[PDB]
RNA sequence: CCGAUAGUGAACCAGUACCGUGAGGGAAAGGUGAAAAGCACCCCGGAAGGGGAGUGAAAUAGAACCUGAAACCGUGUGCUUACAAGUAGUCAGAGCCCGUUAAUGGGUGAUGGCGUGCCUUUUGUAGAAUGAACCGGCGAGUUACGAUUUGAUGCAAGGUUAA
RNA sequence: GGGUAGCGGAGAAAUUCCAAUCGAACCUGGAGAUAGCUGGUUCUCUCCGAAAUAGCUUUAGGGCUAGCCUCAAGUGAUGAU
RNA sequence: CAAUGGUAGGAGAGCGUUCUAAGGGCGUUGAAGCAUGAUCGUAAGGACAUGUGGAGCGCUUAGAAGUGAGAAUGCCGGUGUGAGUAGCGAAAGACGGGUGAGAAUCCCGUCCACCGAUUGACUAAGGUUUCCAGAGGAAGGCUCGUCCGCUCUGGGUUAGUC
């Protein structure tokens, strides 16, 4: 059976990722939130 | 299909009354004073 | 601390108390001088790369500096130490006699 | 007098070691060496080098005479268990126990 | 005020293993000894493990290393048991084995009498109505303000202050 | 390789699919939503000790007042046979 | 002299647990905790002796509370029963020699089998050192293991035209 999640390096970085996040006002809110929690990776 | 009560320790040790093993035949060898199984070769200077 | 690497001291605690000795190394971070002849040790000298199988290797172990007290030179008995400024520098004095 | 030997955390379930110890309990050590090397069970090679080490402790450390030595006590104690898993049919796991054993063997010349 | 199931999620290389495409969710895990003085050397074994010797007050204080409960798993034994119908006890009671916080003692137990768990919920449960596999931890009428009633204390035609 | 996003998309139409989910996805917050319903609520002795009935109620497996219990301070034979 | 069965409930008197005040005590000649015992009080409960343990802890009067568990298809840990039971994941091996403490299972040989529009050869994506050579056998491997995609310490990817 085909499963969800067929991985894809370039799709992964265009939908989730630093520049995509820093493009929207709500994406910068995600990254602010993860910084005050102290996550080791932000995106 | 599934146990209705647990098994007590008493009832478990009675079922295991017969779960044991016996020693082998294991006679002494005439060539070397030793021990070997009956009707098999000796594992010590193999003679028969 | 208040004891240096050359002073001769007495031991006022431990099982080797009442012994006069000389100081040979201080170890100030953990506060434990190594006096000569006190606190003898028995280490198992294993076979080394450039040594033999050995035996027991006698040596000295550190001692807490609170179990030691200097010796004023005149009377030769234990005493605390103070300071008085002379020659522009700091100077140890024996609290019951003159300078060290 | 008595002499002792132990093997700690031998990776065999204590139920399985115990079948073979009930064969040599109270036997003369010359006959029990042969029972263990003429038996087909997995613990037999392990148990007999606990038995030979106890006979060696008897002659070297205690100056005994191996001819009249006997197996006085032989037992297996539960050692600590490892935790493992087995995947099952529809997303669920089940528990495996990897159980160990402490083994003790006492020999004695039977005197006082 | 807490004292390692507590106190921060985190006393420890914690927003970390790990889980999720992502937003996000989110642990477990402290203690050698005063001092490493951390077991030279011999013996069995391929090693692991062990028995001695030694260091130390102490080594079941030997690195999962303060103490070490219960459930559970064993080894040895004193009394008992293969004609018997058991909610497993209790009251009566021989025979045998022991000897105390020394008092009309302790262990076992042939045989006799009488005896259908506990909780919850119900008119009524041995219930074939509910819940619990066992052991351990820890898990539910608090205290702020206001009202009322009772006790107890000061003062009394007066009593009492708030910021 | 791209685009359509939940008070929304997509649908040769089945209440079908939108990350093993869909009569309205998932995650965080308001938040200890509310729960006249079920389940739990932990030491010991002593004294007393009942109700499953009126009446009203979008009210009958809920509630309120009275009837029946207790404790205290009064009244003083007014209770029973 | 008289009273004393008791659920829902009302009322009274107490036992024990942590912390504080004041007073007075005990502890390396061994405190607390733990274990065992044939002891004491009307109950909740209190002592004493020994064993282990290694530094703190009771008593009296008063005060203050995260103050007492057998039940919640309770929460977390760790141990049973079922039980030496089910299973051990599509398909063919045999023998000889060798290596080793240990061989059905590792290496070499011969024969036999199986796929062959594929169980062969390439290559995108994806994965990121699994690649190679020496060494190892704790755990992983559904058995074993002297072996390994596992552990150890040394290496390995070369472009004007792909
Ligand atoms: Zn022979």
């Amino acid at each position: 059976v085909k499963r969800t999640y067929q991985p894809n390096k370039r799709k992964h970085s265009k939908v989730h990722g630093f520049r995509k996040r820093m493009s929207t006002k709500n994406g910068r809110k995600v990254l602010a939130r993860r910084r005050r929690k102290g996550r080791k990776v932000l995106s | 299909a599934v146990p209705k009560r647990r098994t007590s320790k008493t009832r478990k040790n009675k079922r295991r009354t017969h779960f044991k093993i016996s020693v082998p035949g294991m006679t002494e060898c005439p060539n070397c004073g030793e021990y070997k199984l009956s009707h098999r070769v000796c594992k010590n200077c193999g003679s028969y | 601390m208040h004891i240096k690497k050359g002073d001769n001291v007495k031991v006022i605690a431990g099982k080797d108390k009442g012994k006069e000795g000389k100081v040979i190394a201080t170890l100030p971070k953990k506060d434990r001088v190594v006096v000569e002849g006190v606190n003898i040790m028995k280490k198992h000298q294993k076979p080394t790369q450039l040594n033999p199988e050995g035996g027991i290797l006698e040596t000295e172990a550190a001692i807490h500096v609170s179990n030691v007290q200097l010796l004023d030179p005149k009377t030769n008995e234990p005493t605390r130490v103070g300071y008085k400024f002379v020659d522009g520098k700091k100077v140890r004095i024996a609290k019951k006699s003159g300078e060290e | 007098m008595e002499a002792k030997a132990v093997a700690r955390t031998i990776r065999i379930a204590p139920r399985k070691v115990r079948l073979v110890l009930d064969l040599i309990r109270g036997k003369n050590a010359a006959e029990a060496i042969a029972i263990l090397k003429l038996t087909n069970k997995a613990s037999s090679p392990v148990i007999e080098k606990v038995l030979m080490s106890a006979l060696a402790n008897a002659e070297h450390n205690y100056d005994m005479n191996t001819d009249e030595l006997v197996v006085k006590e032989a037992y297996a104690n539960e050692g600590p268990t490892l935790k493992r898993f087995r995947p099952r049919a529809q997303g669920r796991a089940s528990a495996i126990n990897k159980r160990t054993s402490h083994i003790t063997i006492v020999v004695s010349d039977g005197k006082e």
Side-chain angles (χ1 to χ4, degrees), chain A, chain B, chain C residues 1-44 47 52 54-55 57-100, chain D:
Chain A
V1 168
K2 204 171 171 231
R3 294 311 189 171
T4 77
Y5 201 42
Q6 269 64 235
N8 191 353
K9 263 175 199 95
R10 171 207 195 164
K11 186 178 306 172
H12 197 59
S13 300
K14 75 183 171 67
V15 173
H16 326 97
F18 198 74
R19 316 202 75 233
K20 188 44 187 276
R21 291 274 148 80
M22 68 185 212
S23 296
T24 49
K25 183 187 275 307
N26 289 130
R28 283 175 280 135
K29 277 188 84 175
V30 162
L31 291 177
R33 190 283 168 179
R34 290 171 86 65
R35 267 163 173 141
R36 93 278 182 277
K37 212 194 182 161
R39 293 276 192 169
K40 178 173 281 298
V41 316
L42 307 175
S43 48
Chain B
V2 88
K4 190 58 141 53
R5 304 273 325 125
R6 62 187 209 171
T7 312
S8 183
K9 298 189 223 175
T10 311
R11 168 172 326 261
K12 178 179 70 183
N13 287 141
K14 291 171 154 177
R15 192 192 54 234
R16 296 188 180 162
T17 306
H18 293 290
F19 309 159
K20 68 170 79 172
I21 57 189
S22 67
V23 295
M26 207 191 65
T27 43
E28 301 224 334
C29 179
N31 208 61
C32 296
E34 274 299 338
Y35 273 101
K36 65 186 273 290
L37 296 187
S38 299
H39 287 87
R40 284 89 201 281
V41 191
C42 190
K43 296 313 313 299
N44 185 301
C45 290
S47 174
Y48 185 90
Chain C
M1 282 311 287
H2 59 310
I3 288 92
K4 286 84 65 187
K5 200 214 190 171
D7 290 329
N8 63 327
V9 286
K10 201 182 102 163
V11 179
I12 67 183
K15 54 162 68 90
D16 291 330
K17 79 181 293 193
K19 292 178 161 185
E20 319 288 317
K22 170 178 191 264
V23 192
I24 63 171
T26 288
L27 303 160
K29 294 309 288 180
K30 87 178 155 180
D31 213 352
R32 264 182 174 71
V33 296
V34 183
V35 161
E36 187 201 14
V38 296
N39 226 328
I40 297 292
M41 202 165 74
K42 283 149 191 57
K43 192 159 171 43
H44 283 305
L57 185 145
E58 308 276 331
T59 187
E60 317 283 359
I63 199 174
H64 198 251
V65 79
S66 300
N67 308 338
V68 162
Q69 211 169 13
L70 271 61
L71 295 159
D72 52 353
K74 274 71 70 176
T75 76
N76 192 284
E77 62 182 359
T79 186
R80 299 177 307 269
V81 297
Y83 300 90
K84 69 171 182 65
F85 283 94
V86 172
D87 195 32
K89 301 296 300 158
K90 198 179 306 190
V91 168
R92 274 177 170 68
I93 61 173
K95 272 273 169 68
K96 47 180 62 181
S97 296
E99 198 268 334
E100 292 289 355
Chain D
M1 189 182 173
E2 316 170 346
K4 207 210 202 182
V6 189
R8 299 187 68 228
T9 309
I10 288 277
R11 218 202 167 196
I12 296 177
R15 281 185 66 194
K16 294 174 199 204
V17 177
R18 262 161 207 154
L19 304 171
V20 185
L21 294 176
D22 295 348
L23 297 189
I24 72 163
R25 210 179 270 124
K27 255 68 186 185
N28 295 84
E31 170 207 339
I33 301 287
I35 285 158
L36 299 172
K37 68 95 176 181
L38 265 294
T39 309
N40 210 42
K41 298 291 266 176
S43 53
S44 285
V46 177
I47 298 172
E48 74 165 314
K49 57 161 173 68
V50 188
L51 194 167
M52 295 278 311
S53 180
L55 299 161
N57 293 354
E59 69 153 1
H60 179 275
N61 301 333
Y62 302 140
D63 212 331
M64 285 197 202
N65 168 41
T66 55
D67 304 329
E68 78 275 342
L69 258 53
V70 182
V71 168
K72 188 143 88 73
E73 285 317 325
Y75 45 94
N77 272 333
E78 182 81 35
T81 310
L82 304 177
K83 68 170 287 166
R84 302 309 191 236
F85 285 111
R86 197 264 204 203
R88 296 307 282 241
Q90 275 181 62
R92 50 158 66 99
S94 306
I96 309 305
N97 296 126
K98 284 322 179 185
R99 298 192 206 112
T100 46
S101 317
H102 302 338
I103 314 191
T104 309
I105 283 181
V106 184
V107 289
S108 165
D109 46 12
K111 71 182 53 182
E112 281 299 340

